[PDB]
Amino acid sequence: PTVTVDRPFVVLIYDEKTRAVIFMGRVADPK
């Protein structure tokens, strides 16, 4: 049972109670 974030991925930071999305994006090139 394995999750490897080794490729481009979509990212969402959100509040659980309100389901409010605070930041949205896609990470394709770390630095």
Binding site: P1, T2, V3, T4, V5, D6, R7, P8, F9, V10, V11, L12, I13, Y14, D15, E16, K17, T18, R19, A20, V21, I22, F23, M24, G25, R26, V27, A28, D29, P30, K31
Partner: protein, 335 residues
């Protein structure tokens, strides 16, 4: 979903996703995308409060559904500080020193956005930038210096939202388990990225319909990061196409507790992104407020005002402790 705060949160999310979709029109598949819908909605709420006519209308339709009264309730509910969690948001509105403002405008911005209006001599602009930045920094314990770079003499107002989040993982990663690993941007272009490692109980699921792995990384607070990885990095447009409020609810329903331990591998990185949003918001229907025939007549009658410029700048830092994220939206208003 049913609750008052939840409806306005999905409106704002709705705005966010719609914006996401415009950003894709100008993003090579090696590009990072990162922005806060709240920050941008807050800055545009302030503009809405001064809009009238066609300008107000377009803006109301973009921001969805006393509409703005439950927006301040949401922000009150979200912005909180507790063990291993901080979410803080600040609006600030600067105004031209000579310029008379209507009181219904200044009071609705103080009541719904928590900003008192500070006046500024934008004519002396070197100092104007230092003064504005110094005020912003004072009010955000030095997390946000240099939010403003430049200001025109004929600038009449500048609206600012900032938002700062710092969340500790519920399951913190061990630094000892952090080695470089090939991150594949591509089928061909790889790179060595310090990659973190942990065995914890995380909710995950395969999205069969979108050929991609979904995982929920909780923070302390009531917050978490959702991470969606397409299996083939050529599936990424159909993933990024589907993003919506309904898709979000989908992904959250498909997530169980799923609390058997999982093997997670996640990059450690700091990325930052900038935008000029004029064209994106124009496509989304808010083209009016940038015209020389824009109506911002609820702000002042002394001058005919339009939105000159809207920037959005954001930063994402993931590490073993958690995630740190800043955003800053700036709106410049001229005649």
């Amino acid at each position: 979903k049913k609750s008052k705060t939840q409806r306005i949160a999905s409106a704002v999310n709705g705005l966010g996703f719609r914006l996401y979709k415009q950003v894709l029109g100008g993003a090579g598949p090696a590009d990072n995308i990162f922005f806060s819908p709240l920050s941008i909605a807050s800055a545009l709420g302030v503009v809405t409060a001064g809009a009238n006519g066609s300008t107000r209308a377009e803006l109301d339709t973009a921001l969805g559904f006393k509409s703005m009264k439950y927006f301040a309730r949401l922000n009150g509910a979200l912005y909180k500080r507790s063990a291993g969690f901080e979410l803080m948001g600040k609006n600030v509105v600067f105004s031209k020193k000579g310029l008379w403002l209507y009181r219904q405008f200044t009071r609705t911005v103080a009541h719904l956005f928590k900003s008192n209006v500070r006046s500024v001599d934008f004519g002396d602009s070197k100092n104007a930038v230092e003064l504005m930045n110094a005020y912003i920094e004072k009010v955000t314990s030095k997390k946000f210096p240099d939010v403003i770079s430049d200001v025109d003499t004929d600038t009449s107002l500048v609206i600012v939202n900032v938002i700062y989040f710092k969340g500790s993982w519920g399951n913190k990663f061990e630094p000892d388990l952090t080695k470089n690993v090939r991150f594949w941007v591509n089928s061909s272009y790889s790179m060595m990225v310090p990659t973190m490692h942990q065995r914890a109980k995380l909710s995950y699921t395969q999205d069969r319909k979108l050929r991609s792995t979904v995982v929920k990384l909780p923070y302390e607070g009531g917050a978490s990061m959702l991470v969606i990885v397409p299996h083939r990095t050529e599936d990424l447009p159909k993933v990024e196409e589907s993003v919506s409020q309904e898709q979000l609810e989908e992904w959250l329903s498909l997530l169980g507790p799923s609390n058997h331990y999982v093997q997670l591998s996640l990059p450690k990185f700091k990325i930052s992104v900038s935008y000029d949003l004029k064209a994106y918001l124009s496509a989304m229907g808010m083209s009016s407020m940038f015209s020389y025939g824009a109506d911002l007549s609820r702000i002042t009658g002394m001058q005919k005002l339009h939105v000159d410029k809207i920037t959005h700048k954001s930063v994402l830092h993931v590490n073993e402790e958690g995630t740190e994220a800043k955003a800053e939206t700036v709106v410049g208003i001229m005649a």
